[PDB]
């Protein structure tokens, strides 16, 4: 599969009268899940669990209600796997990948925010055709090209192209010019937006240069960030 961040407290217990929630996001067999854990660090049982996502850039929405049809007892801890889809109300957020969430129990409604790792939103179908890559790279306005440095990374081209493909970032073509390795790479997000990349590897220096061309280039920062976490874990 792709890279999955270890979960992280999203809702501290002290901010929700003992209800602690922690989570991550996954993309497995082309379906997106919010992978949660609820722990009851409160004095009494918790019931009537429910979830709502607010309006967000990628129009992310759960596919079912929260399936925890159970009383959550003190010091009890459970893993919930909430399926998601991107058919819901869209609205460009700041930061672009911030999701506002509200969880309800018998006690109250609690609000929290978390950042969707953009790689879970990369679709299985992001491998551009080479001539189409060529022409599209030529096509995107040239001020829509952005340059990034992948720091202290020591993996070779094969390993980089391998890791990256596990996350639906495709390696279209490979060019070795001047002992510097060059990888051409497309990815497609869930809202259709393409990201084309040229990644540049050179023995000697443990810093990779990442050239991203996207039609909405405000995305590209978040794409690099994801390149960085992928190639570092």
């Amino acid at each position: 599969g792709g890279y999955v961040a270890p979960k992280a407290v999203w809702l501290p217990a002290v901010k929700a009268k003992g209800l602690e929630i922690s989570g991550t996001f996954t993309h497995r067999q082309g379906h997106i899940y919010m992978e949660m854990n609820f722990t009851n660090k409160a004095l009494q049982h918790m019931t009537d669990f429910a979830i709502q996502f607010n309006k967000n850039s990628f129009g992310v929405i759960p596919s079912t209600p929260l399936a925890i049809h159970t009383p959550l007892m003190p010091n009890q801890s459970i893993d919930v796997s909430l399926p998601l889809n991107t058919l819901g109300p869209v609205m460009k957020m700041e930061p672009l990948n911030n999701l506002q969430v509200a969880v309800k129990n018998n006690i109250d409604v609690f609000y929290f925010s978390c950042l969707i790792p953009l790689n879970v939103l990369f679709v299985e179908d992001g491998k551009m055709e080479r001539q189409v890559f060529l022409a599209t790279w030529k096509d995107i306005p040239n001020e829509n090209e952005l340059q990034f440095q992948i720091k202290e990374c020591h993996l070779n081209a094969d390993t980089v192209s391998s890791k990256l493909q596990n996350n639906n970032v495709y390696t279209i073509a490979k060019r070795n010019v001047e002992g510097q390795d060059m990888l051409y790479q497309s990815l497609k997000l869930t809202n259709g937006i393409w990201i084309l990349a040229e990644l540049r590897i050179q023995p000697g220096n443990p810093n990779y240069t990442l050239s991203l061309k996207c039609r909405a280039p405000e995305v590209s920062q978040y794409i690099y960030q994801v390149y960085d976490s992928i190639l570092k874990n």
């Binding site: 429910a50 709502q52 607010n54 506002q100 509200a102 309800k104 609000y111």
Partner: peptide, 11 residues
């Protein structure tokens, strides 16, 4: 900030 619903009747 109160964007969420959760109403006990809802049909």
């Amino acid at each position: 900030n109160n964007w969420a619903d959760f109403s006990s009747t809802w049909p």
